[PDB]
Amino acid sequence: LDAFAKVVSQADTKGEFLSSAQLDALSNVVKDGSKRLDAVNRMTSNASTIVANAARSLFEEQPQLIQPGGNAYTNRRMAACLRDMEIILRYVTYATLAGDSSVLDDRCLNGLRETYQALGVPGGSVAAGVAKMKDAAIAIVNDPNGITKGDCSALVSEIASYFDRAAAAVA
């Protein structure tokens, strides 16, 4: 409704009906909103798979994490690791829904590096796990089956930026 009211102001200033350009512009706002909801829906609905695929890739790459002495050794520690990735993924979907990183920053990333240091969690391995969630999430967002075909590339880039910001915040 924000973009619609601004277009009214512009048309009224001209004293004209909406132009074809203004109608296509507003139509693209509605299309972008719908694509954004598909991305949030696909990431939300598949949240456990995104977490599991990333964790599997991280542990296979960094087996020390789940060998004796590792920070994610024993299932109890492993489970808390999966829970952390779920939390970060949750705030990435919030950012995707809102179109900005304000909640992701204020509620999740601000001070998170310092929580991990208080705990001895290796933030650089959290960053790798977040970057792997990114790739799993994007493969799910970009799957063309089950959805109206179209371009989601700008949205996928924006989603990648949220994952990269979260990873860089904890490294």
Ligand X SMILES: *[C@@H](C)[C@H]1/C(=C/c2[nH]c(/C=C3N=C(/C=C4\NC(=O)C(CC)=C4C)C(C)=C\3CCC(=O)O)c(CCC(=O)O)c2C)NC(=O)[C@@H]1C
| Residues within the interface to ligand X (CB under 6 A) | 23-24, 27, 30-31, 34-35, 37-39, 41, 65, 71-72, 77, 80-81, 84-85, 87-88, 107-108, 112, 115, 119, 121-122, 125-126, 129, 141-142, 144, 147-150, 152
Amino acid letter, 170 = V
d(CA 36, CA 30): 10
Tell me, rounded to whole angstroms, the distance of Cα 139 from its chain centroid.
Answer: 12
Smallest distance, Å, CB 106 to its own copies?
10
DSSP string, 81-138: HHHHHHHHHHHHHHHHHHTSSHHIIIIIITTHHHHHHHHT--HHHHHHHHHHHHHHHH
Q: CB 119 → its own copies: shortest distance, Å?
A: 20
Q: Could you give the CA distance from residue 36 to residue 5 in angstroms, rounded to a whole number?
A: 21
* Shortest reach from residue 93's CB to ligand X, in Å: 12
CB nearer to ligand X: pick between 19 and 100: 19
Look at residue 84 and give the partner it binds from its own copies, ligand X, none, a contact being a CB closer than 5 to 8 Å depending on partner kind. ligand X
Token output for 156: 């996928």
| 171, interface contact from ligand X, its own copies, none, CB < 5-8 Å by kind | none
Q: Which is nearer to ligand X, 95 or 126 (CB)?
A: 126
Rounded Cα–Cα distance for residues 166 and 171 (Å): 9
Sign of CA dihedral 96, 102, 103, 107: positive
Contact of residue 56 among ligand X, its own copies, none (CB under 5-8 Å per partner type)? none
Q: Which stretches of the chain bind its own copies, using CB under 8 A?
A: 1-2, 4-5, 7-9, 11-12, 16-18, 23, 26-27, 29-30, 33-34, 36-37, 40-41, 44, 47, 90, 93-94, 97-99, 103, 107
Reading the block at residue 9, the tokens are 């102001």
Could you tell which of its own copies, ligand X, none binds residue 152, using a CB distance below 5 to 8 A set by kind? ligand X
